[PDB]
């Protein structure tokens, strides 16, 4: 399985590791101001439009990856 940081709410430093279900193929980290999101996700939705409409944030940067626990803060210069 792919293990990602996955917090249901934005969290300054998400430490919750979960085994994503096979529905997902990516780990996502997104920074929107001081809000940081960490999710099991899909690469088909790892794009600005799809992340903004799903997380309901106007302005953000994002990174997706497919190695264990790869969706960490330092991946995103922001």
From Swiss-Prot:
Q: What is the effect of changing residue 24 to R?
A: Some loss of function. Some lysis
**Sequence ranges assigned to domain UPAR/Ly6 in this UniProt record:** 2-78
Membrane topology, record value? Lipid-anchor; GPI-anchor
One GO MF term on file is: complement binding
**Modifications made to the protein after synthesis:** N- and O-glycosylated. The N-glycosylation mainly consists of a family of biantennary complex-type structures with and without lactosamine extensions and outer arm fucose residues. Also significant amounts of triantennary complexes (22%). Variable sialylation also present in the Asn-19 oligosaccharide. The predominant O-glycans are mono-sialylated forms of the disaccharide, Gal-beta-1,3GalNAc, and their sites of attachment are probably on Thr-52 and Thr-53. Glycated. Glycation is found in diabetic subjects, but only at minimal levels in nondiabetic subjects. Glycated CD59 lacks MAC-inhibitory function and confers to vascular complications of diabetes.
Which positions form S-S bridges?
4-27, 7-14, 20-40, 46-64, 65-70
Residue positions with a glycan: 19, 42, 52-53
Localization, per the record, is:
Cell membrane; Secreted
* Effect the entry attributes to changing residue 34 to E: No loss of function
Spell out where lipidation (GPI-anchor amidated asparagine) occurs.
Answer: 78
Q: Does the keyword Nucleotide-binding belong to this entry? A: no
Which Gene Ontology cellular component terms are annotated?
cell surface; endoplasmic reticulum membrane; endoplasmic reticulum-Golgi intermediate compartment membrane; ER to Golgi transport vesicle membrane; external side of plasma membrane; extracellular exosome; extracellular space; focal adhesion
Q: Keywords of this protein's UniProt record, alphabetized?
A: Cell membrane, Disease variant, Disulfide bond, Glycation, Glycoprotein, GPI-anchor, Hereditary hemolytic anemia, Lipoprotein, Membrane, Secreted, Signal
Impact when changing residue 43 to K? No loss of function
Quick check: keyword Transcription in the entry? no
Q: What's the impact of mutating residue 54 to E?
A: Loss of function. Lysis
GO biological process, any: cell surface receptor signaling pathway
Q: What outcome is documented for mutating residue 48 to E in this protein?
A: Almost complete loss of function. Lysis
What is known about what this protein does?
Answer: Potent inhibitor of the complement membrane attack complex (MAC) action, which protects human cells from damage during complement activation. Acts by binding to the beta-haipins of C8 (C8A and C8B) components of the assembling MAC, forming an intermolecular beta-sheet that prevents incorporation of the multiple copies of C9 required for complete formation of the osmolytic pore.
Look up the record and name the associated disease. Hemolytic anemia, CD59-mediated, with or without polyneuropathy: An autosomal recessive disorder characterized by infantile onset of chronic hemolysis and a relapsing-remitting polyneuropathy, often exacerbated by infection, and manifested as hypotonia, limb muscle weakness, and hyporeflexia.
Quaternary structure, from the entry:
Interacts with T-cell surface antigen CD2.
User: What protein name is recorded for this chain?
Assistant: CD59 glycoprotein
State which gene encodes it.
CD59
């Amino acid at each position: 399985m792919l293990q990602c940081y996955n917090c249901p709410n934005p969290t300054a430093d998400c430490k919750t590791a979960v085994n994503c279900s096979s529905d997902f193929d990516a780990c996502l980290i997104t920074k929107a101001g001081l809000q940081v999101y960490n999710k099991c996700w899909k690469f088909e939705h790892c794009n600005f439009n799809d992340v903004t409409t799903r997380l309901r944030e106007n302005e953000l940067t994002y990174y997706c990856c497919k190695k264990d626990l790869c969706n960490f803060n330092e991946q995103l210069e922001n």
